[PDB]
Every structure is written in structure tokens, then in C-alpha cells.
């Protein structure tokens, strides 16, 4: 799993576009800029359909999971952003995110966001899966 600061995104996102992007850090502009950088270079290659979810104890995860599951009539690739909670993943958000790490295929560009990954919590089954295949932008 690559680890590259906000400043260098334009380079690594220009050369290589991952199937996942963890934009962690409590920085207001860096976080945005980085996602606006991915959803930018994204649009570049077929991604006309974008989505976003405010991760909490109310979010309809079937919409999400079945979204990664769907096929488009116009081949429009999707950019699934997620606004994780300001205090890191919750009790079981580490399960669905794990389920989610399974639903991932190549048209779907997962983009998770929030603040510094919960100290040592980083262990959740999901983060583990993504690990090899994604990029972690330090927007701190």
C-alpha cells in the first residue's frame, strides 16, 4: 500500500489510478483537494456516475453493496466516495467495509475519506484486504 502526501497526488493519480483511495486526515482543504483530484482524473476515464455516502448508524448499505453489484446500460464507471465518521469507523463499520472490500471490481473506484485512521484500529478485516491494492493519501 503506497503512502503519498496530498502535494504529490497529481503525480501518482496521473500515472496510476487505484481501485481504492484512503484520504485520511482532519485537514479541510487537503482532504477535499485530494478527492476532487481523484474524481477529476476519474471522470477522465469513463466515470460519469459518481456517488457518496455519509457513513453512520443509518446508512443503507444495500444501496452501496448492490451498487458495486450493478452493471450500467451506458457503461458509465462509478466513483464510490464515502464520508467516514470524524471518529474513525464504528463498532461494525469494519464489517460492511470488509464486505465492501469484497464487492470491489475494476469499474468501481472506492474512495474512503475522513481523519487519521483510528490509532491502532487500522487492523479491521477490510483495511487488511485493500492494503496491497490501494493508495493512502496523507491529507492530515
Amino acid at each position: 500500500m503506497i503512502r503519498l502526501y496530498p502535494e504529490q497526488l497529481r503525480a501518482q493519480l496521473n500515472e496510476g489510478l487505484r481501485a481504492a483511495y484512503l484520504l485520511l486526515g482532519n485537514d479541510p482543504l487537503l482532504l477535499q483537494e485530494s478527492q476532487d483530484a481523484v474524481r477529476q482524473v476519474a471522470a477522465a476515464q469513463g466515470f460519469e456516475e459518481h456517488h457518496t455516502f455519509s457513513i453512520d448508524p443509518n446508512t443503507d448499505w444495500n444501496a452501496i453493496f448492490s451498487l458495486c453489484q450493478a452493471m450500467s446500460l451506458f457503461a458509465s464507471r462509478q466513483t464510490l466516495l464515502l464520508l467516514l465518521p470524524e471518529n474513525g469507523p464504528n463498532a461494525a463499520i469494519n464489517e460492511q467495509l470488509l464486505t465492501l472490500t469484497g464487492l470491489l471490481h475494476d469499474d468501481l473506484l472506492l474512495i474512503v475519506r475522513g481523519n487519521k485512521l483510528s490509532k491502532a484500529q487500522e487492523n479491521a478485516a477490510w483495511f487488511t484486504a485493500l492494503a496491497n491494492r490501494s493508495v493512502q493519501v496523507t491529507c492530515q
Binding site: 460519469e48 444495500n62 453493496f65 453489484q69 450493478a70 452493471m71 446500460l73 458509465s76
Partner: protein
């Protein structure tokens, strides 16, 4: 201005113009109704700047020309609060408007009619007439497929297009698509426009199926519909709607036909059986047979087999129960027909009898 109206005549309209609005006055004037009296009729108008509704009311008792603006909600309640059968004499006086009935008498504040963001007339590029029931069928047959807050705004609405003596509507959200065409016995130049989601909903609502035929006018940036004493106007979405003809499965070779009601029932309990409802369903077609199964990868499962009319080449394909059921409920009929290709290319559901409406659904990953 001045008018007197049986409370019963003014209620329906008052409720129609100051209708689906009521979020928050983005602007003061926007929470007001424009009242105009001129030539035997009273015209009430409401607007949110995306679409406006006008209601005409025949003034039978003595009346007097004029125009003003008054809080829609308050005025409505006032009327709604009087006892039924009560006549309501309204009269402008100063910068206040008087509502008098029996001995109850109120007075509301106003704002100049001149300031009402009323739409200055435009010119229709095309216009025609069709029964209300025809418009109803067109919108009902395809509206469930519109996008909702999708980032591709030109999808958060319904397409309206003409060609020959036919009017068709097509809705889509990237995943499923619905289209319906109806003859309107009128030579129309071929034209095409996107009506906003909110516009379509309202147009839908205002149809009472009744004797009054509908009269439509498509301008360049607006569309208008006169249904009896109401007139709906909406802005069109400014974008290019995708070509629905390029996504219809091409020269399908796999065709199955089953009982709509039965197909529904089977998907209903394939849904009930699924603990992972995002997983959807998995169908299997083989000569004159359909094995459907809610699919959950790590558990073995019970499949239900249906007697269907199929043949050609057997195959498997995943589906989202919603999409399919939506179509079955839309195709309220006896038998349904489905045309396939691949486990990766779209499918086309359709009534086995008429071909007015057609639905295209994209299979699931599986």
C-alpha cells in the same frame, strides 16, 4: 380588485397553486400567490421558479378587476377554516387584502403583483392534444425509472419526444430503462425534451383521467399543459438525454415467456429467502424452464423451478429483484415476455400482448 366566491369553488384551486411548495421561502414573494381578476375569471398563480401553476376560476357573482399578491398558506387556511357552503368575498384595500365571510373578517398583507416572478410569455415550437388518460399511461408506464439526484442531472427527469402521430416518454437511471409510445392522431414534427423529475410528478398528479382532454405546448426552455382550468408550466432540463435505441438488446435470440403474476410470486419469495438483499437474484434459463434463486455465495441454496416457455440456448444471469418486480408491477398483465442475450448484456421485459411499453434492465454482476 374584488370578487365573491362560494368557499367550495376556491378551495380546490387554492390548494393546487400553493401546492408542492412549502419548504422555506427562499424569497418572501415566493411564499405568495398572485391573484388576478379580469374578465369574468379569477386567476391564481404559484411559483418556485422551476415550475408554475395557474388556476382559472369563473367569477359568476359581481366582481371587479385588479391584481395583487398574498401569503398562500395563510390565505388558504383562512378559507379552509370557514364553514362549508360559505361565500367568500375578498377585496383589496390599501396594501392589505380583505377576506370576509358571514361575520368572520380578516385582512392579509400583500406585495405588488409587478414583483411576482411570473413567467413572461414564451413561444411554443410544437403543441398538441391527447386524452388525459393517454398522458397518464405514458408517465405511469415509465416514471419509476427516472433517476433521483443522480450526478448526471439529465437523468433526473423524463424524456418527451415526438415523431409521426406518436408521443413517447423514456426514463432511465443508468441501470433500468422504461419507454412507452402512444398514437395521438396528429402529425407532429419530430422533437425531443427533458422534463424535470419534479415537473413530471406534478403533471402526473394533475391528471384526473376525466373528460377534459389535455393540451400540451413545448416551448424551447419550458413545457406547458392545460388541463381544464389548470395550467402547469415547467422548465426543461438543459442536457442531452442518452440514446435509448442504442441500449435495447440487439437482435435478441433468447426469448422466454411466463405468467406475469407467477414470475412476480417467484421473485417475491426469492427476495424473502435472501438474507443479503443486495445480492439479488440468479436466474437460469433452459428449454422451457426457469430456475430462479436468491444468490448467497457462501451458503448452499434452495432454488425454485418454474414452467415457462423458453428455448434456444440455456444460460444463467443475475438480477436485482427491485428492477424486475418494478417492471412486472408496471406491466399489469397476464403473460410477460423477456428477451435476453448474455449474462452481461441487457434484457428486455415486455407485455406478451401489446408493445406500447418496453423495459430494458441491466443484469447484475453475480
Amino acid at each position: 380588485m374584488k370578487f365573491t366566491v362560494e368557499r367550495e369553488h376556491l378551495l380546490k384551486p387554492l390548494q393546487q397553486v400553493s401546492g408542492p411548495l412549502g419548504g422555506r421561502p427562499t424569497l418572501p414573494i415566493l411564499g405568495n400567490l398572485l391573484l388576478q381578476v379580469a374578465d369574468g375569471t379569477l386567476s391564481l398563480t404559484g411559483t418556485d421558479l422551476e415550475m408554475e401553476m395557474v388556476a382559472r376560476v369563473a367569477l359568476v357573482q359581481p366582481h371587479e378587476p385588479g391584481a395583487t399578491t398574498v401569503p398562500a398558506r395563510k390565505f388558504f387556511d383562512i378559507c379552509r377554516g370557514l364553514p362549508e357552503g360559505a361565500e367568500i368575498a375578498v377585496q383589496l384595500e390599501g396594501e392589505r387584502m380583505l377576506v370576509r365571510s358571514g361575520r368572520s373578517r380578516f385582512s392579509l398583507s400583500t406585495l405588488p403583483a409587478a414583483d411576482f416572478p411570473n413567467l413572461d410569455d414564451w413561444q411554443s415550437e410544437v403543441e398538441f392534444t391527447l386524452p388525459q388518460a393517454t398522458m397518464k399511461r405514458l408517465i405511469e408506464a415509465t416514471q419509476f425509472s427516472m433517476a433521483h439526484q443522480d450526478v448526471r442531472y439529465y437523468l433526473n427527469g423524463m424524456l418527451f419526444e415526438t415523431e409521426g402521430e406518436e408521443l413517447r416518454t423514456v426514463a432511465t437511471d443508468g441501470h433500468r430503462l422504461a419507454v412507452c409510445s402512444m398514437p395521438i392522431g396528429q402529425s407532429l414534427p419530430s422533437h425531443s425534451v427533458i422534463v424535470p423529475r419534479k415537473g413530471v410528478i406534478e403533471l402526473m398528479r394533475m391528471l384526473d383521467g376525466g373528460d377534459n382532454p389535455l393540451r400540451v405546448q413545448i416551448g424551447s426552455n419550458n413545457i406547458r399543459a392545460h388541463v381544464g382550468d389548470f395550467i402547469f408550466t415547467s422548465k426543461l432540463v438543459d442536457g442531452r438525454f442518452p440514446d435509448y435505441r442504442r441500449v435495447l438488446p440487439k437482435n435478441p435470440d433468447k426469448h422466454l415467456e411466463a405468467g406475469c403474476d407467477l414470475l412476480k410470486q417467484a421473485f417475491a419469495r426469492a427476495a424473502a429467502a435472501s438474507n443479503e438483499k443486495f445480492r439479488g437474484v440468479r436466474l437460469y434459463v433452459s428449454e422451457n424452464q426457469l430456475k430462479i434463486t436468491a444468490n448467497n455465495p457462501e451458503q448452499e441454496e434452495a432454488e425454485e423451478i418454474l414452467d415457462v416457455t423458453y428455448s434456444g440456448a440455456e444460460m444463467e444471469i443475475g438480477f436485482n429483484v427491485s428492477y424486475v418486480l418494478d417492471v412486472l408491477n408496471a406491466l399489469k398483465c397476464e403473460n410477460v415476455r423477456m428477451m435476453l442475450t448474455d449474462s452481461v448484456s441487457s434484457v428486455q421485459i415486455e407485455d406478451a400482448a401489446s408493445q406500447s411499453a418496453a423495459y430494458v434492465v441491466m443484469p447484475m454482476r453475480l
